Structure 1
Amino acid sequence: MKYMITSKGDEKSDLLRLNMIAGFGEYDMEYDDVEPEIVISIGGDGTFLSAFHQYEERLDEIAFIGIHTGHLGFYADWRPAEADKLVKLLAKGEYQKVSYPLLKTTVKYGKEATYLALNESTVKSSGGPFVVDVVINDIHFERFRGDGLCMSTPSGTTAYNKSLGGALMHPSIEAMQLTEMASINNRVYRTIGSPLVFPKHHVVSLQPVNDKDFQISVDHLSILHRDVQEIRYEVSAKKIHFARFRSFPFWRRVHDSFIED
């Protein structure tokens, strides 16, 4: 069917892309980067994230596949030496697909904006102190003072969330995980400390107390938002779909990446 290939841009990735395209030309496959049904990322997980966000409006019509030309990735989890075998099995079609949960972020002002994150969304202050009221399902949970907060997807738990002390969650669990950055705790200020794992349909709301300006990140992209009234997090109804061509279990991927490979 229709497909496209994105590259990290170095010689290795660019030349691997041209060789899969050449390989694909031996099949009933059309290169189309406007309405593809297969998106191949060649590079690292950062290349994959840009591919995901490039096409985040046609997520239900696309199966993603990532090839790592550097170290192993959690999304770019196939080796360049399998490019030829990848071309053949993608061309034949009839491959199985796997879906990962996504994180929806809503930002409201005094209109509103929504974003999809594949890894995580983080909130920090614009320059001064960071204080927000944390509201879970319309109930006030805590007044957070610290460097910021991070809301992770399950597949995102191995990224920023891991550096902040969060748990690693198998991505078949539809959930989101909130971690703290450098919270201050004393006799007058109190945060939960522990990461928090929220299921589908639970809404976590961040509401300002003094400053209304926040640096908000979604995956790689970070933008200063001004006059913010609320930041809402919930597990998205949308999912990212991967082409599955063999078994590479999440826990094995965790092992290869953090234990030894």
Structure 2
Amino acid sequence: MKYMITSKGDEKSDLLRLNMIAGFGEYDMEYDDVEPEIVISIGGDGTFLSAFHQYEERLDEIAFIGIHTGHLGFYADWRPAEADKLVKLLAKGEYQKVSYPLLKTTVKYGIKEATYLALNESTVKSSGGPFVVDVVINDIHFERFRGDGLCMSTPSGTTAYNKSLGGALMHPSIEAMQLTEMASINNRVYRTIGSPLVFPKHHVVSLQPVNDKDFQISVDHLSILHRDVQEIRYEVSAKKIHFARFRSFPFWRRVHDSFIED
């Protein structure tokens, strides 16, 4: 059906994209980057994240596929050498779709609301000075966090920033989000839980400013300064990203290949 291809934009990725478009020309496949049904990303995980955010309003109508042209990217299922095989299999169709959970971030202001969707994670840091927030879980005051910041990760994000922060890797069939600390202060007077926390669907984690109300909020690649923040709210999204799957590539093998050996 309708499909489009994003490229990382180096020569290897552009030419692979051109060759796949030529190969798709030999089938009932219309290039359409307004309303695609398949979105192919050629590059790295950064490329795949940008493709996801380019179509985040049509997530339920799109299956994604990643081709990694560098060292294996985690959202990539294919090497460039298999692209012809991919064209042919997509062209037929009848592949299997798998869905991963996503993270909703809501940012509320003084005098207003912005929501963002994350495939990897949403993080919060201060805009300059100390970072201090009260952490409220389903309206229960849980802790006052002092430190560098906090990271809230989807399951497929757990292998990314979350992992570097000591968080657990969780299989993406678990509808959850995971909160990790960045350099928390713990002494006689200041206390945090320390451990990563794993939240199910429908739990709401709210960060509330204590002093400064300005924060740097990142969602996947994109980092914005928000001013006069009243609340940051995290919950598992009702929306999901869908991947087209043509063969078995289990998550735990994907983890093995990315971190142990390949």
Alignment TM class, shorter chain as reference:
over 0.9
Mapping 1:51-130, distance limit 5 Å:
51-110=51-110, 111-130=112-131
Alpha-carbon deviation of 1:34? 0.2
Alpha-carbon deviation of 1:78? 1.1
Q: Over residues 131-179 of structure 1, what are the superposed CA-to-partner deviations in whole Å (9 max), with x where a residue is unaligned? A: 0000000000000000000000000000000000000001110000000
- TM-score, reference length from structure 2: 0.99
Q: 1-side partners of 2:31 and 2:187: how far apart?
A: 59
Mapping 1:126-141, distance limit 5 Å:
126-141=127-142
Q: Over residues 100-129 of structure 1, what are the superposed CA-to-partner deviations in whole Å (9 max), with x where a residue is unaligned? A: 000000000011000000000000000000
Q: 1-side partners of 2:154 and 2:201: how far apart?
A: 11
Alpha-carbon deviation of 1:94? 1.3
Runs of 4+ off more than 3 Å:
none
Q: 1-side partners of 2:211 and 2:153: how far apart?
A: 26
Alpha-carbon deviation of 1:76? 1.6
Q: 1-side partners of 2:39 and 2:233: how far apart?
A: 30
Alpha-carbon deviation of 1:73? 1.2
Q: Over residues 37-79 of structure 1, what are the superposed CA-to-partner deviations in whole Å (9 max), with x where a residue is unaligned? A: 0000000010000000000000000000000000111102311
Alpha-carbon deviation of 1:92? 0.8
Q: Over residues 179-215 of structure 1, what are the superposed CA-to-partner deviations in whole Å (9 max), with x where a residue is unaligned? A: 0000000010000000000000000000000000000
Whether 2:199 is the aligned partner of 1:198: answer yes
Q: 2-side partners of 1:203 and 1:213: how far apart?
A: 21
Q: 2-side partners of 1:251 and 1:79: how far apart?
A: 19
Tell me how large the CA RMSD over aligned residues is. 0.4
Q: 1-side partners of 2:199 and 2:82: how far apart?
A: 37
Q: 2-side partners of 1:236 and 1:194: how far apart?
A: 23
Q: 1-side partners of 2:85 and 2:198: how far apart?
A: 38
Q: Alignment partner of 1:46: what SS?
A: helix
Unaligned 5+ runs, structure 1: none
> 2:255 maps to what in 1?
254
Alpha-carbon deviation of 1:233? 0.1
Q: Over residues 6-65 of structure 1, what are the superposed CA-to-partner deviations in whole Å (9 max), with x where a residue is unaligned? A: 000001100000000000000000000000000000000100000000000000000000
Q: Alignment partner of 1:83: what SS?
A: helix
Mapping 1:181-260, distance limit 5 Å:
181-260=182-261
